[PDB]
Amino acid sequence: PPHGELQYLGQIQHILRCGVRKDDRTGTGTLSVFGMQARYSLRDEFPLLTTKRVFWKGVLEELLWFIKGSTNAKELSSKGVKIWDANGSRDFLDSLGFSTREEGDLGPVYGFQWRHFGAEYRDMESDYSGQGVDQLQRVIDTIKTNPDDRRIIMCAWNPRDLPLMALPPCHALCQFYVVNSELSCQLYQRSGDMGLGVPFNIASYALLTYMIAHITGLKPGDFIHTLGDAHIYLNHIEPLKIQLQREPRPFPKLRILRKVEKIDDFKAEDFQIEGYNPHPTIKMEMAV
Amino acid sequence: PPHGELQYLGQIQHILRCGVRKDDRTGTGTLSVFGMQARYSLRDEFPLLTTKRVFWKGVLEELLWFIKGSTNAKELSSKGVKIWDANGSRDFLDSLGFSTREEGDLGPVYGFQWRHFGAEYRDMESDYSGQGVDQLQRVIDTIKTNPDDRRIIMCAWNPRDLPLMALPPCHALCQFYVVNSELSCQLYQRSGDMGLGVPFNIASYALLTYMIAHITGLKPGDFIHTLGDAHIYLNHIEPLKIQLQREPRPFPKLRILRKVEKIDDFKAEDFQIEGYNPHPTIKMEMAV
Ligand SMILES: Cc1nc(=O)c2cc(CN(C)c3ccc(C(=O)N[C@@H](CCC(=O)O)C(=O)O)s3)ccc2[nH]1
Ligand SMILES: Cc1nc(=O)c2cc(CN(C)c3ccc(C(=O)N[C@@H](CCC(=O)O)C(=O)O)s3)ccc2[nH]1
Ligand SMILES: O=c1[nH]c(=O)n([C@H]2C[C@H](O)[C@@H](COP(=O)(O)O)O2)cc1F
Ligand SMILES: O=c1[nH]c(=O)n([C@H]2C[C@H](O)[C@@H](COP(=O)(O)O)O2)cc1F
């Protein structure tokens, strides 16, 4: 059976061979394709890429950060994960005309939309308990009890909240699905930085699916990744060309180390990736 | 070059051959597959299906209805199109809890979220002039001023408005994309009745692409249809086996008969389908 990672790389080779040139907001420029889909089995494997070393600690920490509802970049930075610091910096904030905003404050982004969709956002430090829809919880409840439901969706695209956010969410909505005691997730990623964001994003929603499978007594099934604008930034082409030449290695496995009963009780120590020996890291310059 | 229609039929064959048996809200039963994508070209063809007659007037009147921002089945029925009536009727309203709602009042459905996302829904006869977000206008604006934008997005999934609607939307979101003067559109459909809904839906969003292309100066490109739960109801397996035997005739054409400027200007007579020569219609009864 072909390797899970070939979905990703074929998407790469596809964009390199057939992407069209197209300008982007950042000035960098891209080769791009509109609409793609990739299926990654979660069954006795976890799709953390092997053709380059993906920042696992960053994946797990980012997710726990969304779970607890945080729109504070500093809560994440302090766990040693820097990935949102630039989006929360004073300068970046000034550039979007948020001179009045405390730094680290990303606006009403992922964690907020996941746990409080509809609440009126004030700042990153306010308490929102009982405000808006706890979409993440409504998903776990439907799955436990009415698993055949075709509406198990969590959406972060809030048009009322877009003008306040430091970055409009790129993983806009996702849907869970249950058959034969398997929990599958599909992600609509409106915009996908193939070299940098994407491999991370696959680990992210793969993991979310493991967590949710765990607390609901289901076995993980498929992760289905759908992209809108799938782009390779021009400065990523050489590094990616390098990446392609590597033979993929067995995907690692994921061990959840104890019985956890609520999603919010999960802590970093509960997760152990075993058997991960990726090829060496590949730096891609992030466009700003 | 294979016929675009072979994408639709291919998905039916895939479901029938590989779908897992899955229960549904209506107790009808289905054959289900989670996560699919198809790409219909819109260049010098319009993907109205030929392997059975698609109710085109219905497509056209339903879209103008959504554009008008209407949420009243009667304003669509009066134009000879009855597809939303069961959902807007007294008994059905009461069944859902809306003792209080005037007959025809579907709640805050597609038209509302497209035109006035965020506004507190009153009833169907209300005026919502400048009251929530106008996702539709914004999409056209963004295509005109900044075509390269990776956030050209329309969303009907408002978790708050959900418990007020007759049927949570299947057209959960769509994204528009521009490159080399070509406009494309990707629809995310969380739930597809492959027999009844889907062929209608393909036409629907293909039309909207042709409209927005017309008032933005663009040639239409691809429509990408992505699927959440792609099902065939059990009492559709037979009509569809009949349907798979017919050989598709060349897709028809569509012409916009006059230069129109705003999206609201469009009227049913602005559109002519040329060359639509379908096989005889097959009735698929709607599961309830
Ligand atoms: C143009 C752009 N592309 C992105 O991929 C992107 C990603 C994020 C946030 N995000 C979802 C990220 C996931 C991983 C990331 C990253 O830069 N990590 C480096 C390693 C950094 C480290 O080791 O500390 C990497 O994966 O190479 S950034 C924010 C803005 C963006 N902007
Ligand atoms: C379970 C279910 N499946 C659906 O496909 C569906 C579709 C709609 C709305 N919709 C998107 C529809 C599109 C087309 C329709 C229909 O019934 N068409 C007939 C009318 C033709 C005629 O008599 O002239 C048909 O296709 O034959 S209904 C509403 C609830 C649903 N419910
Ligand atoms: O999780 C993410 N994944 C990702 O690929 N991006 C990239 C895609 C794009 O390159 C940029 C967002 O840019 P835009 O808003 O112009 O689509 O970030 C961002 C994330 F947060
Ligand atoms: O445009 C549509 N297309 C469609 O396929 N459905 C179908 C999908 C499903 O069979 C049912 C909705 O039920 P659920 O909400 O349980 O998915 O209606 C409804 C529409 F309005």
Residue numbers in the entry:
A (entry chain B), B (entry chain A): 26 to 313
What's the paper's own text on this?
Human thymidylate synthase adopts two different conformations, named active and inactive, that equilibrate with each other. The equilibrium position depends on mutations, on binding of substrates/substrate analogs/inhibitors either in the active site cavity or at the dimer interface, and on crystallization conditions. 5FU and RTX are both used in chemotherapy against solid cancers. They inhibit hTS by targeting the enzyme active site. While FdUMP competes with the substrate, dUMP (2′-deoxyuridine-5′-monophosphate), RTX competes with the cofactor, N5, N10-methylenetatrahydrofolate (mTHF).
The present crystal structure of the hTS:FdUMP:RTX complex shows six independent enzyme subunits arranged in three homodimers in the triclinic unit cell. All six subunits are in the active conformation and host in the active site one FdUMP and one RTX molecule. In particular, FdUMP occupies the same binding site as the natural substrate, dUMP, and is at contact distance with the catalytic Cys195. In the hTS:dUMP/FdUMP:RTX ternary complexes, the phosphate group of FdUMP is bound in the same way as the dUMP phosphate; RMSD upon superimposition of the two structures showed only minor changes at the interface of the two subunits where it engages salt links with four arginine residues belonging to both dimer halves (Arg50 and Arg250 from one subunit and Arg175′ and Arg176′ from the facing protomer), and a H-bond with the side chain of Ser216. A double H-bond bridge, reminiscent of the nucleic acid base pairs, links the FdUMP pyrimidine N3 and O4 atoms to Asn226 Nδ2 and Oδ1, respectively. The fluorine atom of FdUMP is within contact distance (3.6–4.0 Å) from the side chain of Trp109 while it does not interact with the side chain of the catalytic Cys195 that points away from it. RTX, besides giving the mentioned stacking interactions with FdUMP, is involved in few H-bonds with the enzyme: the quinazoline N3 and O4 atoms are H-bonded to the Asp218 side chain and to the NH of Gly222 respectively. The RTX terminal glutamic acid displays weak electron density and appears disordered and in different conformations. However, no covalent bond between the protein and the nucleotide is found in the X-ray crystal structure of the hTS:FdUMP:RTX ternary complex. The existence of the attractive stacking interactions between the pyrimidine and quinazoline rings and the absence of hindering interactions between the two bound inhibitors lead to a stabilization of the active complex.
